[PDB]
Design a protein around this ligand. Structure first.
Ligand SMILES: Nc1ncnc2c1ncn2[C@@H]1O[C@H](COP(=O)(O)OP(=O)(O)OP(O)(O)=S)[C@@H](O)[C@H]1O
Ligand SMILES: Nc1ncnc2c1ncn2[C@@H]1O[C@H](COP(=O)(O)OP(=O)(O)OP(O)(O)=S)[C@@H](O)[C@H]1O
Ligand SMILES: Nc1ncnc2c1ncn2[C@@H]1O[C@H](COP(=O)(O)OP(=O)(O)OP(O)(O)=S)[C@@H](O)[C@H]1O
Ligand SMILES: [Mg+2]
Ligand SMILES: [Mg+2]
Ligand SMILES: [Mg+2]
Lengths: 327, 293, 170, 315, 288, 340
């Protein structure tokens, strides 16, 4: 059954009606299919915005139960070399229709991983077979796509999911499976999602697993932070205040206590402090330059692995030195 | 240094077949082979070290095969060591075999000659008739130094960790069945590494396995297999080695197998001859663990 | 209809757009290579595109080959005097019973016979598929065998290589 | 399912091609005279290279187009064996074309052929040039080996001007009876960036999605080009403004960091407003950021630090 | 036996010959096995444009046991690595038995000889969401139907394979006075070649060109189907053992081939999207 | 139809296919010349060192029609040749890919051919699509018909008369065993029927030998190893050796190993031998090896046995090999070494 599947797959939209946050694109595609004027599509966007789900739902709507033999889907997991493009795709696009269901769709998922030769060969396949064949190209990085392929496909940008769409989908998930989510917990979940629905679903599943009895227990912000392990906003505010106001010893003690009470990671703390500082009042540009450069260098050092205490002291010193420029 | 050999296929067909088998086997493994002509016997060696890894083939042919056997040299035991291209000798041997099949009593004469027209490099002047057309072949060959010849040595196999397996004669009632058993695994496309296993208590049984994430091939033998005068003995070997063993088994009768657990495989073939009994020519093939346990 | 660079081709050695010094050097080298027992066996001409390598080679052959070519006694293929001053290798020839890599070999093993009464200048401008590793190795081995060959007589061999870059291809 | 207008209204005669008037007139004269030489047409994608070559071949041949044109392309195998057999036999084929005409081998997207294929093409052109002519079409002319270039006349197609795009768009709109305004056509031209295929596709999408063509309607389907936003981000007086542009117009719109860095490098290459040293330092910082992103740290903080370093260099 | 499905037989040669018809469909694809009381069905689909379905009847198997009363049939999937060679096989009779116990258990094939015992296990795979039954022929509207001998069709397919055929044209025409024309026109490096079957009953038996309806037969209309030879050559092996071949074209352009040898093979292949003008002109010239 | 010919015999089909395959072996494109009396399929390599000719008489085909006056398309292939007897001969020559012709002429595996037709149509009422295309119609015994229209390029014919000169020299020098007189008369008849013209410097050597021995020797030879072939003729024996020359590199290192394979027979075994009074000649092996196999394909029992005739002269002069069949003539010309 579907109950065994992870929520990221159990709650995969089955129809375009369940797709949220892409209203303009959804309406444009509805009009295209209704008027029978669907052009070559290029869905460009970051991970987990609903490109694969949207195209699958569109294919279901156009055909219905024939989606198996009306659509050819190729992704990175499959071989997509020049030879594959020259034989399999060419054969699929050069054959007549089973039931004259409009056209044949080719979903080149994760096409940004295709080789340049494959794209060059595929451009003329796209151009030659367009009377009864359609192409959809899904990508997260456009610079990996050849300029000609970009020009020959109508581009649709999948923006990060707005807050309202994610709230609606969370409400639908809660209704489907008995569970309660506090407004503060929902706000924290939205903040940590950063416009990714996969993160939303994974965190919700893990938070339900965190709750002892998922029948009468309500998800709270504390549960969300404990499950995700990310710092709470209060900890970030306190550590920033200590760094910007307290002495070196006090700041070191505060940071150590904050990151040892819950075993927090320094990368998350630095990201939170950066986000907080990005919306502060600065009277000098050199302060911002110092903050940005030093913090970016510290994150780069952290990415490679080093001494945790050294990096924490580096963050504290960089912040203190940069903020000394003011006044 | 004088070398003169005379061969007659009509007389003593068994030893002629032995020579054919040795030449074909050496030519089906590598490009060049070592020939040691001694006062008592002729040795044909196919080894990777020339002048797991690939296996080694050693063939010993008694001097009684050749009607005339004149081997004279200044080295001990009048040993003459040569390096010869297997393809040339193999082609000459096909020519002689078809000439004999056409029906003739001609004798093949092999001599060593120096070539000033062309590590001294010499030629083998293989000459035979065909009823008459004179067939002559100057096969290039390289004379090998005494020390270099001494470098090549027969592999040694431990006899305490090894158990011999006696195979049914090819001419017996079980010969065809055992040949089919051997060839069972020579018809699968992607199979490259077979897994031979021997179980003691039919006193003993031999099985061939192929394990894969998708495939599981397993062949048992139910015929009477004897052990030449503890039950876990397995070895992984390439399919080419097993095919070579299969071809070898189809020619000889007293075939013996041995599996040194996770160490190697030994395939021994002997040709009995009546008279005490004459020296028994042998063919020994050593196969190294392709993958191992 | 005919393109001018083909219509207005040189009719003599004096119409070739080649400097005097380079022309004299090529003349001397080629004349030396035509001697009964010539020290030099291969003339390797390298240069950019359209610098008149093949043009000057052919123009010099038209004058040199008739001078050294031994007269025949009615052994010519046809009644014509066998106007074959230059023998060139064609890299797109696909005969039936021959592997591709063996094509050039089959050319060279024939080219050796174009000496004395059958004297002809062997020009190699259309190289085999040297981008194939095995083909390139075979070509190098054949050239080495030609250089180290042990025949009393060989025909002059000229290899014209147009030095050019290979654009970065996908 | 009607065909898209990019293909429905594909020009069939050279006189219907807008822009590059000089080269199109030269092609018309070539078609009239018929003495077509070997040629290489290079230019930006979607400006009328394939269309121009096909129209020239059609005008030259007519009833003999099918038997006198051998169209090869990237999607079709174009190896050394192909040159050895198919191209060779086509060149050897003896036709009966009018006195001043020759067979045409259209090697579209010729900048992707293998080196061995081009080396064989050298000989096939050296031998079969009396009755066969080659019309290479590519984006970069240098991608054809020099021996082949030596025999071919080079035509570089320029980027389409606004006037030609507007004229062709107006003709298409009149044919389709599409309702339009001035601001909408201006926006379509601005977003086209000289690529007429992109312009036609955007116009069709806008009309099919919203009906009447408007500036807002066009902007809905098509966003502002990424390079212009990046250029505005780079050319800034205050670091705060550059950060605001990067956040609102690039990060929040769903643009990956790698794309932003690559476009920043491309823009800095062609920018001519500051001294060489400043541009050099900007390129250096962009390269450092690209390195730090390729190893996994594709965060917004890295781009912010890159902008801060660039601004410090400017001052 | 104590298994959901267990069959045993001695006519291993027939099963091997029938299974040898599945080779041309590649080695990186998969084979669907349908188990039912009626018998065995082997299904392969390639490029979503060609499919083959081979039926093995109950009578062929000496003993058949289908104890899965819960479901009238069982679906399983097997990867074709070298399974074609596995079921390929001296003097002594060889008994072939197939065993399968529900989903999650390997498909077991055991060969029993006088002194040799073989057992091979094949792992199963998740059934592809793609429905292999999506490609079928509509019986209501059949453009034309033909009956041909297997030997002649196999010879023609071999001839096309030899010349390196690249594109294939199936041409069918029915005229008055018992005039039947069935031809294969190959576009290849040779140019355009034509192979026309005779009007003799022994080779070409009986023809209709309905024009779409399956009821009325008209005379003068020619049905032309354009195919990629890659798909068309995948039935040559099936035709080699064929005793009779039934061809059917519908208006939609799907080609159906029934191969009768008590083993029946049904193949459906699609037609190419469009026909080039030069190809049509050459077809007209060749047929005049 | 401008040109029409048909074959209705299995052995004739076999020999035709073998000849076409050999010609495709020598050269990628085979040259077919059609005349009122014969059809000549020939080839020559790029080095101009080997020339292979196979002439099929009109009797080789049950039906043979040649109407050059009807040809309109490809007029550049029509040629006219003057004759010594005040006559003009009209011929049409074209070039056809040898591989395609071979792949069209092969006998199907299992099926039999009842008729094999070759036709060229370039008349006034010739469809444009059917212009400069060779028409081939193959009928199977099962009433199946196959049609092919491979492209052919018109060309001009330059006759080779080296064989004529060699025959003239051979007759002048060596012109008793009645068979030798019959050979002399046959050579004289060949010289006279041809529409073209006819001390110590008149070296000429002739050897007629049963093709069985040479064919058996050559079948075993491998061209990849034994590149060269050397013939030694004495007054007592004939030796044929397939050999290779050793090549040594920088430090006297073998760059290419040398192998020899020789067969010697007595002159009594030879059918005929005539020497100018140990004569050694050297040439290539591949073309001779492939050429010796064309004749036996027909497997005829009547007329004469399968004998090969060899003519040669001083080193460096060409060597000529000749074979005959009831309606076919096979000729091979090769260039020999000039070391001595
Ligand atoms: N608009 C949406 N509405 C509802 N659920 C969504 C939406 N977008 C994503 N999801 C959920 O998140 C999952 C992500 O599926 P995808 O469509 O493959 O995401 P994506 O945009 O393709 O990410 P990439 O680019 O493939 S890494 C879906 O299976 C849903 O469970
Ligand atoms: N005065 C001239 N001198 C030399 N070449 C000329 C002259 N006039 C015309 N040409 C032609 O210009 C072409 C260039 O000469 P080539 O010798 O073929 O160039 P190249 O040195 O061979 O370079 P590649 O390798 O062929 S691109 C030839 O086709 C010549 O026939
Ligand atoms: N100059 C032009 N005038 C009119 N329409 C044009 C012009 N350029 C492009 N188009 C239209 O855009 C379509 C595509 O143009 P193409 O010529 O195929 O693109 P392109 O210039 O060849 O780029 P490549 O090389 O294929 S990536 C044509 O079919 C026309 O409808
Ligand atoms: Mg996806
Ligand atoms: Mg040149
Ligand atoms: Mg183009």
């Amino acid at each position: 059954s579907k109950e065994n599947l992870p929520w990221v797959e159990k709650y995969r939209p089955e129809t375009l009606d369940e797709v949220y946050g892409q209203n303009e694109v959804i309406t444009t595609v509805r009009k295209f299919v209704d008027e029978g004027k669907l052009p070559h599509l290029l869905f460009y966007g970051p991970p987990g915005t609903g490109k694969t789900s949207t195209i699958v739902a569109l294919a279901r709507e156009i055909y219905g139960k024939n989606y198996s033999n009306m659509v050819l889907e190729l992704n990175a997991s499959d071989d997509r070399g020049i030879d594959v493009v020259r034989n399999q795709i060419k054969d699929f696009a050069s054959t007549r229709q089973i039931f004259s269901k409009g056209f044949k769709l080719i979903i080149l998922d994760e096409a940004d991983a295709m080789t340049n030769a494959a794209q060059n060969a595929l451009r003329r396949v796209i151009e030659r077979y367009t009377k009864n064949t359609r192409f959809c190209v899904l990508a997260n990085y456009a610079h990996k796509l050849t300029p000609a392929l970009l020009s020959r496909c109508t581009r649709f940008r999948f923006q990060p999911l707005p807050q309202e769409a994610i709230e609606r989908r969370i409400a639908n998930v809660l209704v489907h499976e008995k569970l309660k989510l506090s407004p503060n917990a929902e706000k924290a979940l939205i903040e940590l999602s950063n416009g990714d629905m996969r993160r939303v679903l994974n965190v919700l599943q893990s938070c339900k697993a965190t709750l002892d009895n998922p029948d009468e227990d309500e998800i709270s912000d504390d549960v969300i932070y404990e499950c995700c392990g990310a710092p709470r906003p209060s900890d970030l505010k306190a550590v920033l205040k200590s760094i910007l106001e307290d002495d070196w010893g006090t700041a070191h003690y505060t940071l150590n206590k904050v990151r040892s009470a819950k075993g927090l990671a320094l990368i998350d703390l630095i990201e939170g402090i950066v986000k907080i500082l990005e919306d502060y009042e600065l009277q000098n540009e050199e302060t911002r330059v110092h903050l940005l450069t030093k913090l970016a260098d510290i994150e780069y050092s952290i990415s490679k692995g080093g001494n945790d205490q050294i990096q924490g002291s580096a963050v504290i010193g960089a912040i203190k030195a940069s903020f000394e420029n003011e006044t | 240094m004088k070398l003169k050999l005379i061969v007659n296929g009509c007389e003593a067909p068994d030893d002629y077949k032995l020579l054919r088998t040795t030449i074909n086997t050496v030519a089906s493994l590598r490009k060049t082979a070592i020939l040691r002509f001694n006062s008592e016997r002729l040795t044909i060696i196919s080894t990777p070290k020339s002048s797991g890894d690939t296996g080694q083939l050693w063939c010993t042919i008694p001097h009684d095969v050749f009607r005339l056997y004149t081997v004279i040299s200044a080295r001990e035991l009048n040993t003459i060591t040569m390096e010869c291209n297997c393809d040339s000798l193999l082609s000459v041997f096909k020519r002689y075999d078809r000439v004999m099949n056409q029906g003739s009593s001609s004798n093949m004469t092999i001599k060593l000659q120096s070539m000033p027209e062309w590590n001294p490099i010499c030629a083998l002047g293989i000459t035979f008739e065909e009823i008459v057309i004179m067939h002559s072949f100057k096969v290039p060959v390289k004379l090998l130094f005494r020390a270099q010849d001494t470098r090549i040595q027969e592999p040694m196999i431990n006899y305490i960790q090894l158990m011999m397996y006696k195979l049914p004669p090819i001419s017996g009632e079980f010969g065809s069945a055992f040949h089919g058993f051997i060839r069972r695994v020579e018809r699968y496309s992607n199979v490259n590494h077979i897994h031979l296993m021997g179980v003691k208590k039919d006193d003993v049984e031999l099985k061939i396995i192929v394990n894969e994430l998708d495939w599981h091939l397993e062949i048992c033998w139910n015929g009477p297999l004897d052990s030449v005068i503890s039950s876990t003995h397995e070895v992984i070997i390439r399919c080419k080695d097993w095919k070579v063993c299969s071809k070898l088994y189809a020619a000889f009768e007293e075939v013996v197998l041995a599996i040194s657990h996770d160490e190697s495989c030994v395939f021994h073939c002997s040709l009995d001859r009546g008279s005490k009994p004459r020296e028994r020519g042998q063919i020994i093939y050593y196969i190294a663990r392709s993958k191992g346990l | 209809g005919e393109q001018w660079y083909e219509k207005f081709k040189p009719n003599c050695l004096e119409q070739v757009a080649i400097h005097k010094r380079k022309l004299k050097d090529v003349q001397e080298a080629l004349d030396a290579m035509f001697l009964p027992n010539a020290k030099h066996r291969i003339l390797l001409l390298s240069g950019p595109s359209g610098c008149s390598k093949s043009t000057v080679i052919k123009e010099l052959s038209k004058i040199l080959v008739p001078k050294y070519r031994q007269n025949s006694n009615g052994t010519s293929f046809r009644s014509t005097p066998n106007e074959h001053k230059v023998t060139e290798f064609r890299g797109d020839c696909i005969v039936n019973d021959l592997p591709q890599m063996e094509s050039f070999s089959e050319f060279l093993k024939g080219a050796r016979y174009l000496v004395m009464s059958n004297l002809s200048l062997i020009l190699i401008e259309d190289l085999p598929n040297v981008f194939h590793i095995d083909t390139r190795r075979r070509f190098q081995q054949l050239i080495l065998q030609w250089l180290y060959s042990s025949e009393p007589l060989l025909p002059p061999l000229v290899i014209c290589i147009t030095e050019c870059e290979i654009p970065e291809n996908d | 399912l009607q065909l898209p207008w990019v293909e429905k209204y594909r020009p069939q005669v050279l006189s219907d091609i807008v822009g590059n008037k000089e080269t199109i007139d030269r092609l018309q004269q070539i078609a009239k005279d018929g003495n077509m030489p070997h040629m290489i047409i290079s230019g930006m994608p979607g400006i009328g290279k394939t269309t121009s070559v096909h129209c020239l071949a059609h005008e030259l041949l007519g009833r003999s187009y099918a038997d006198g044109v051998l169209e090869l392309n990237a999607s079709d195998d174009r190896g050394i064996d192909v040159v050895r057999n198919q191209i060779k036999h086509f060149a050897q084929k003896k036709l009966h074309l009018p006195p001043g005409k020759h067979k045409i081998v259209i090697l579209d997207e010729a900048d992707s052929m293998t080196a061995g294929a081009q080396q064989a093409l050298r000989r096939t052109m050296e031998l079969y040039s009396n009755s066969t002519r080659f019309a290479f079409a590519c984006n970069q002319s240098n991608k054809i080996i020099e021996p082949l270039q030596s025999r071919c006349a080079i035509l570089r197609y320029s980027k389409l001007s606004d006037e030609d795009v507007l004229k062709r768009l107006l003709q298409i709109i009149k044919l389709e009876d599409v309702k339009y305004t001035n601001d909408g056509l201006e926006a379509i031209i601005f977003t086209a960036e000289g690529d007429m295929r992109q312009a036609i596709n955007n116009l069709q999408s806008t009309v099919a999605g919203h009906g009447l063509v408007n500036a807002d309607n066009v902007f809905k389907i098509v966003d502002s080009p990424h390079p212009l936003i990046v250029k505005k981000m780079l050319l800034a007086s205050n670091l705060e403004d550059s950060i605001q542009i990067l956040r609102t117009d690039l990060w929040k719109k769903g643009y990956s960091s790698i794309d932003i860095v690559t476009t920043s490098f491309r823009v800095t290459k062609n920018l001519a407003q500051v001294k060489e040293s400043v541009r050099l330092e900007m390129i250096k910082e962009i390269g450092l950021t690209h390195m730090r992103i390729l190893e996994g740290v594709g965060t917004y903080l890295q781009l912010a630090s890159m902008l801060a370093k660039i601004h410090k260099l400017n001052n | 036996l104590a298994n959901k499905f267990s069959a045993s037989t001695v006519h291993l040669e027939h099963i091997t010959t029938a299974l040898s018809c599945l080779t041309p469909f590649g080695s990186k694809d998969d084979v669907l096995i349908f188990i039912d009381a009626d018998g065995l069905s082997f299904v392969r689909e390639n490029n979503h444009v060609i499919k083959i379905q081979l039926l093995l009847s109950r009578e062929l198997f000496m003993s058949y046991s289908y104890r899965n009363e819960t479901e009238d049939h069982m679906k399983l999937c097997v990867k074709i690595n070298h399974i074609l060679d596995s079921v390929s096989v001296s003097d002594d009779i060889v008994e072939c038995t197939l065993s399968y116990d529900g989903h999650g258990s390997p498909f077991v094939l055991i060969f029993e000889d006088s002194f040799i015992s073989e057992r091979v296990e094949y792992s199963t795979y998740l059934i592809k969401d793609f429905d292999t039954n999506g490609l079928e022929l509509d019986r209501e509207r059949i453009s034309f139907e033909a009956i041909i001998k297997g030997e002649a069709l196999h010879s023609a397919l071999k001839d096309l394979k030899e010349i390196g055929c690249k594109e294939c044209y199936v041409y069918a025409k029915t005229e008055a006075n018992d005039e039947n024309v069935f031809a294969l026109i190959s576009k290849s490096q040779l140019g355009f070649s034509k192979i026309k079957l005779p009007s003799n009953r022994s080779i070409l038996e009986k023809l209709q060109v309905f024009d779409g309806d399956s009821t009325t037969v008209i005379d003068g209309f020619a049905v032309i189907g354009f195919f990629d030879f890659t798909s068309f050559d995948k039935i040559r092996k099936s035709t080699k053992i064929a005793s009779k071949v039934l061809f059917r074209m519908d208006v939609h352009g799907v080609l159906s081939v029934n191969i009768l040898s008590g083993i029946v093979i049904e193949v459906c292949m699609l037609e190419k999207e469009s026909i080039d003008e030069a190809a049509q002109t050459e077809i007209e010239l060749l047929m005049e | 139809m401008s040109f029409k010919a048909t074959i209705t015999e299995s052995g004739k089909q076999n020999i035709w296919f073998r000849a076409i395959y050999v010609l495709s072996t020598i050269q990628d494109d085979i040259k077919i010349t059609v005349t009122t009396n014969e059809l000549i399929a020939w080839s020559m390599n790029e080095t101009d060192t080997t020339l292979c000719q196979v002439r099929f008489q009109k009797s080789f085909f049950e039906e043979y029609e040649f109407k050059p006056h009807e040809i309109v398309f490809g007029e550049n292939g029509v040629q006219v040749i003057e004759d010594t007897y005040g006559n003009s001969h009209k011929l049409y020559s074209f070039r056809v890919n040898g591989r395609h012709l071979t792949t069209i002429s092969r006998k199907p595996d299992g099926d039999g051919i009842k008729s094999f037709t070759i036709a060229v149509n370039n008349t006034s009422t010739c469809p444009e699509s059917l212009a400069n295309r060779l028409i081939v119609v193959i009928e199977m015994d099962s009433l199946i018909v196959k049609e092919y229209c491979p492209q052919f390029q018109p060309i001009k014919y330059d006759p080779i008369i080296i064989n004529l000169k060699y025959k003239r020299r051979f007759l002048d020098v060596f012109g008793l065993d009645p068979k030798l007189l019959d050979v002399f008369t046959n050579t004289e008849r060949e010289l006279t029927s041809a529409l073209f013209n006819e001390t110590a410097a008149d070296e000429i050597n002739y050897i007629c030998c049963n093709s069985t021995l040479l064919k058996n020797f050559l079948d075993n030879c491998n061209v990849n190893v034994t590149d060269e072939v050397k013939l030694e003729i004495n007054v007592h024996r004939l030796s044929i050796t397939a050999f290779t020359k050793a090549v040594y590199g920088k430090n006297n290192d073998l760059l290419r190993n040398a192998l020899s394979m020789s067969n010697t027979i007595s002159t009594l075994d030879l059918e005929h031998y005539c020497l100018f009074t140990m004569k050694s000649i050297i040439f290539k092996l591949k073309d001779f090896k492939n050429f010796i196999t064309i004749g036996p394909s027909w497997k005829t029992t009547q007329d004469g046995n399968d004998n090969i005739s060899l003519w040669f002269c001083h080193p460096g002069d060409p060597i000529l090999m000749q074979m005959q069949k009831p309606g076919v003539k096979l000729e091979l010309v090769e260039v020999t070494d000039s070391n001595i």
